[PDB]
């Protein structure tokens, strides 16, 4: 019946009044005639919180609190918990301090927030580690709170997995401005793909040493979660390119959408009430009195906040009150230092990626050990399988290879499908990776197979040589004149010629 929205100055209440009436025009009306008032300040001061929220208690006993905020003090939202100590009202935390969750909850708390959850943080981290196959880990930490807990999730989610995530143990940057004890630890770094759970100002120091470490090379990788990235609009210098994070950064979501979302969640709680009960839990008498009790005899909304679905989108909760399907934007910096869209998670907890693999191109500025190879399907030099559901996509002998898959013949776009790759040539290349020792990358051909003079214009492997789509071509390539006319050749790999097969 009574819902209030309290916001800061951005896009304004008139369109939010349209949002409230459109929520009353969209779908499934609360029998309950819901009146919503949105009001505005720019304070985050607790005096305001007291006055305004007790005035919301004054006018017709408002049962819902709506807060998206645009400052940077965090336990402000935990300030609202004291509101839950005094009012016992469901509260939906939307932005700012209401977003940046580290908030461990009372059993008496009533807070449901669209911010980051360390479990789901780590799981989306690890599926990022899944699809781009960085199976060696460096696990470098500090001793802020919850970071022992990050270590716990790392150890446990590795041990629970049949992947064979191949580890170094946790190396623990202990205190600040060690500056040579940091060196004592960080010179023990001996891997390729790197994970920090740190702070802002610590990562400043860490990467300032890391350029001096020579671990800021542009074959390395660095994925750090939201607590260091955070403010996308504030871009500090010493961070190199290509760094990877996950956060709820609004690039696609309006404020008003999530406003109507939380209001609809409140109405679903109202509907679950008037199903399994038949009345309304009326609000408290006032703020200022201590009179008789705090018995929630009307059984407040926590069994009622369990299953809430809107609009084809599941918005339920756990026992901890975290969100089962949040929105989870996956972000990388490019060369202009722009936090840009890369990975999306709106679908059944799965990841949707652009597959732009190497983009780190010396921001901290030449390197050419990435090699481009595109090959053909000839057994048993080459056998290609698809991805098996074997707790991962990494088989003991296969290497993934991106095909282009057509949509139809009228749109010639090809989707980069990772597939499993076997045979002679790949085993040869792995032995080259242990002898020649570089980084090796694989693809597959559509344009003919080997090469054909199309009025002296090549197809196939040979055309991929000529027009420099790839540097290297392996195949079981027959070694012949017009082929030797254009390109150079290794000492012949295996022996062939012309034979005759008969019964």
């Amino acid at each position: 019946l009574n819902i209030a929205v309290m916001l800061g100055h951005s896009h304004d209440v008139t369109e939010r009044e349209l949002r409230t009436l459109w929520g009353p025009e969209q779908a499934a009306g609360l029998p309950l005639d819901v009146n919503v008032v949105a009001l505005l300040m720019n304070r985050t001061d607790p005096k305001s919180l007291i006055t305004h929220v007790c005035d919301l208690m004054s006018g017709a006993r408002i049962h819902g609190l709506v807060f998206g905020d645009d400052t940077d003090q965090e336990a402000v939202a935990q300030m609202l918990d004291f509101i839950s100590s005094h009012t016992f009202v469901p509260i939906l935390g939307i932005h700012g301090g209401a977003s940046m969750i580290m908030a461990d909850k009372d059993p008496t708390s009533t807070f449901f927030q669209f911010g980051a959850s360390i479990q789901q943080q780590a799981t989306v981290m690890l599926k990022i580690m899944q699809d781009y196959d960085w199976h060696v880990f460096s696990l470098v930490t500090t001793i802020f709170p919850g970071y022992r807990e990050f270590i716990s999730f790392v150890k446990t989610t590795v041990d629970n997995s049949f992947v064979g995530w191949d580890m170094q143990n946790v190396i623990t940057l202990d205190t600040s401005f060690e500056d040579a004890k940091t060196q004592v630890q960080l010179k023990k770094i001996h891997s390729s793909v790197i994970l920090l759970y740190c702070s802002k100002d610590e990562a400043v120091l860490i990467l300032s040493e890391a350029r001096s470490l020579g671990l800021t090379g542009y074959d390395f990788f660095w994925i750090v979660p939201s607590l260091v990235s955070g403010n996308t609009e504030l871009i500090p210098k010493e961070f190199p390119s290509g760094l990877i994070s996950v956060s709820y950064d609004d690039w696609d979501y309006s404020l008003e959408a999530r406003v109507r979302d939380g209001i609809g969640i409140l109405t679903t709680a109202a509907s679950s009430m008037l199903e399994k009960f038949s009345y309304i839990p009326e609000a408290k008498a006032s703020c200022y009195g201590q009179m008789e009790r705090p018995e929630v005899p009307m059984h407040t909304l926590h069994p009622f906040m369990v299953n809430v679905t809107w609009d084809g989108k599941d918005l339920s909760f756990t026992e901890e009150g975290y969100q089962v399907h949040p929105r989870l934007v996956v972000i990388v910096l490019n060369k202009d230092r722009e936090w840009e869209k890369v990975g999306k998670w709106e679908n059944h907890t799965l990841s949707l990626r652009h597959a732009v693999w190497p983009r780190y191109k010396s921001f901290s500025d030449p390197d050419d050990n990435h090699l481009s190879i595109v090959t053909l399907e000839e057994a048993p030099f080459v056998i290609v399988e698809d991805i098996d559901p074997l707790t991962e996509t990494c088989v003991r002998n296969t290497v993934p290879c991106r095909k282009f898959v057509k949509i139809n013949n009228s749109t010639n776009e090809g989707m980069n499908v990772k597939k499993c790759c076997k045979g002679f040539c790949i085993d040869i290349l792995k032995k080259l990776s242990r002898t020649v020792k570089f980084t090796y990358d694989l693809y597959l051909v559509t344009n003919g197979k080997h090469g054909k003079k199309v009025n002296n214009v090549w197809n196939g492997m040979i055309g991929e040589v000529v027009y420099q789509r790839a540097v290297m071509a392996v195949g079981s390539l027959t070694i012949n004149e017009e082929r030797s006319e254009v390109v150079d050749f290794s000492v012949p790999f295996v022996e062939t010629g012309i034979s005759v097969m008969v019964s």
């Binding site: 304070r43 001061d45 005096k47 003090q73 935990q78 005094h86 022992r148 041990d159 629970n160 201590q290």
Partner: protein, 473 residues
């Protein structure tokens, strides 16, 4: 120069303690620099901040210091003023509290204590290990932040010296029928139990177990200090090992040591550069200090040798390292001081431990049962399984040379197909392992209690639903 210090108290004689401690700080260890401010506890949690903003923050207070309450056990936990400090990351030393939910520096920014939480009591039991030589632990835990943190510091101190606990049990507070868990209990080898809970829970527990007859000789009770309080004092068995943090409740000595810590903290802040000026209004300020973590680092890295309590050095988590501990015993319902600890150095008192069951000798929780549960798998010739007689007994038959075959009763299901009801039947058994274990009987003195597999398979790891959780079959 003008440095303002805030406080929350009960009786105004301790406000006088603050003022004369300010004068002591003017004296002990060079122009004019100090002024005193304090406002007592409220009965309400309603406004709070209005005193804090309008009184202490308006007076540019660097530190507010708060004791418990004039209720000493209530839910009046000094939450909101800490959060008003958390608006501007303002340092507060938790004077008297032990509720370790305040302990996380994430949620509770700068609230460092002179009194340790119950967590370090966990480490005390490790100290007990080194005198009383155990290996096997029973843990009973309240489902708290506190109980889980107790568990975690237990597990870390177990796996820094590789001692390995057997079970951990969980408890919702206020539940009353517990009995299966304590039976649960009586099943195991160890007889050393640690409780971490509230009072009523424990009484609940202490009395309940006494019925479950777990308080006699051969039992155990490692007990936190809230479980050594009032009603918990009335219905536990005597002879339970207990603890006190020494100097637990006279507020004033801790007040004085705190004010002295604050004073040399102020001077060592004045030693530094780019010193910032303190804000007054809450109205018009969302701006954090430049020097919040500098307050923190000065409070962390400081040393204070000659306090009332002695050395006051803080953890990485910022509460007192190496404080003095005492072990007590209610023997004939009177507490007797037994144990003395600087931080780790162990002193028993020469009054002797009446161990709270039988005799004053120190037991062992290593006692077996010799009734060993064995499971067999249907594989000829290593295992033969045949049904019984109509008696339910086993036939008497021969070997090839005619020896009487040793045969074993085995319970298990008939219909060993998946998706079917399974029905417990005793059946006769042959094989190697029978004869092996009877050789082990005549060498080793056990009894042998034999089952079939519930599944009729070996058992490997598979993933159950959500496709990440491994379980052995």
């Amino acid at each position: 120069k003008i440095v303002n210090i805030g406080a929350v108290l009960s009786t105004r004689k301790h406000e006088q303690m603050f003022r004369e401690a300010v004068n002591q700080a003017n004296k002990r260890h060079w122009k004019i620099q100090l002024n005193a401010t304090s406002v007592t506890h409220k009965p309400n949690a309603i406004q709070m901040a209005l005193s804090v903003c309008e009184d202490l923050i308006s007076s540019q207070v660097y530190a507010i210091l708060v004791s418990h309450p004039p209720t000493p056990n209530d839910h009046f936990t000094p939450t909101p003023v800490s959060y008003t400090a958390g608006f501007y990351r303002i340092p507060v030393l938790g004077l008297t509290t032990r509720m370790s939910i305040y302990s996380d520096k994430s949620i509770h920014l700068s609230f460092l204590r002179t009194v340790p939480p119950y967590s370090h009591q966990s480490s005390v039991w490790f100290e007990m290990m080194r005198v009383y030589s155990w290996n096997h632990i029973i843990l009973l835990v309240s489902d708290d932040h506190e109980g889980r943190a107790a568990q975690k510091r237990l597990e870390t101190l177990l796996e820094e010296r590789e001692s390995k606990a057997e079970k951990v049990l969980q408890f919702d507070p206020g539940t009353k029928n517990v009995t299966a868990l304590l039976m649960e209990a009586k099943e195991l080898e160890a007889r050393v139990i640690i409780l971490s809970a509230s009072e009523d829970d424990a009484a609940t527990v202490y009395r309940a177990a006494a019925m479950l007859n777990m308080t006699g000789s051969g039992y155990v009770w490692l007990v936190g200090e809230r479980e050594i309080s009032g009603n918990a004092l009335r219905y536990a068995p005597d002879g339970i090992l207990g603890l006190q943090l020494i100097n637990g409740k006279n507020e004033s000595a801790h007040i004085s040591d705190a004010v002295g810590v604050v004073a040399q903290a102020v001077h060592e802040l004045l030693e530094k550069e780019n010193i910032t000026d303190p804000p007054r209004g809450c109205v018009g300020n969302t701006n954090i200090w430049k020097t919040g973590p500098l307050f923190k680092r000065v409070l962390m890295s400081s040393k204070y040798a000659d306090g009332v309590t002695g050395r006051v050095e803080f953890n990485e988590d910022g509460d007192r390292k190496f404080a003095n501990y005492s072990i007590m015993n209610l023997q004939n319902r009177k507490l007797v001081q037994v144990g003395i600890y600087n931080g780790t150095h162990v002193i028993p008192n020469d009054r002797k431990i009446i161990w709270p069951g039988g005799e004053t000798e120190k037991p062992r929780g290593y006692q077996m049962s010799t009734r060993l549960k064995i499971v067999t798998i249907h594989q000829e010739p290593f295992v033969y399984v045949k049904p019984t007689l109509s008696d339910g007994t086993c036939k008497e038959e021969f070997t090839v040379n005619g020896d009487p075959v040793k045969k074993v009763i085995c319970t298990g299901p008939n219909d060993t197909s998946p998706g079917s009801p399974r029905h417990t039947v005793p059946q006769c058994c042959y094989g190697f392992c029978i004869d092996l274990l009877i050789k082990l009987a005549r060498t080793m003195n056990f009894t042998y209690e034999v089952h079939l597999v519930a599944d009729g398979k070996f058992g490997t790891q598979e993933r159950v639903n959500n496709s990440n959780k491994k379980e052995w079959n």
